[PDB]
Subunit: 107 residues, 3 copies
């Protein structure tokens, strides 16, 4: 039991009597609202969810102005600097054979 | 003065004569459009805003394919590498008692 | 050929017979659905696209709980730690005149 508006059985909007609203097409793209969430569904394999005071994307590449986050959750900025791969020059040292570990970043 | 469509006083859409469109439920989830913004409101404590050629989320955890941004704006990738906490091995040095500071990342 | 709902020629929704749905105002804010995408258009110069199992924002600053990504795709956390600018202390070394390069981050 809901109200449904549809054009040619291809494009739809539905409003139910309990807090659910859905806009969708037969291809499976959807924009949903429920009592506690907003969800954008991409039929090609992505979903953006706002629920519980959190925001989640799960899918393929996220691109924010050229900064990228892979499907595996690794980040590289638009210049190619990877959070998980980057290195730093360290100047002003004596060379030798030992290894030390840096501290966390300044700031 | 606006047009309102509502099902059972639970689900709503409104269109005004000035550029404002709202889709919402009584629980307080909302999708709003104004003359200069699109806003997704999560009643559980989150908001995503597109306005002024900028995009802002303010709320709890942001999760992008397993990479996380805390409510405080600190980032950790899906492997646990924190932008603000990570360290690096530094090989090929002589040990001693001094501290140096690295340069910014290569790349 | 589509169905259009409009209030005062200022606020609009359209549903076509092929999978396209659009909600928009004369100011140029838009929420679009197509057979394979969802697009939020900010007339002030931003666009968020879900398509092909990917999510893209292209525009000005992205702010996620105080962490920022510039229009150029560089990231700084809410404490000012830049992925592309940060440095690390390196303790326990002998000073000298040489440069070494760190390894990638631990973790
Ligand atoms: Fe580093
Ligand atoms: Na990448
Ligand atoms: Na990984
Ligand atoms: Na790198
Ligand atoms: Na510490
Ligand atoms: Na800082
Ligand atoms: Na985290
Ligand atoms: Na903090
Ligand atoms: Na870390
Ligand atoms: Na520099
Ligand atoms: Na690079
Ligand atoms: Na910044
Ligand atoms: Na740049
Ligand atoms: Na920094
Ligand atoms: Na490696
Ligand atoms: Na780790």
């Amino acid at each position: 039991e809901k109200v449904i508006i549809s054009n040619n059985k291809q494009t739809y909007a539905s409003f139910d009597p309990n807090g659910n609203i859905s806009v969708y097409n037969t291809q499976g793209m959807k924009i949903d609202m429920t009592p506690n969430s907003i969800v954008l569904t991409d039929a090609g394999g992505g979903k953006l969810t706002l629920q519980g005071g959190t925001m989640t994307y799960k899918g393929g590449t996220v691109n924010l102005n050229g900064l990228t986050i892979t499907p595996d959750g690794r980040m590289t900025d638009s210049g190619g600097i990877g959070l998980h791969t980057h290195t730093h020059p360290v100047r002003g040292v004596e060379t030798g054979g030992s290894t030390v570990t840096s501290d966390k970043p300044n700031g």
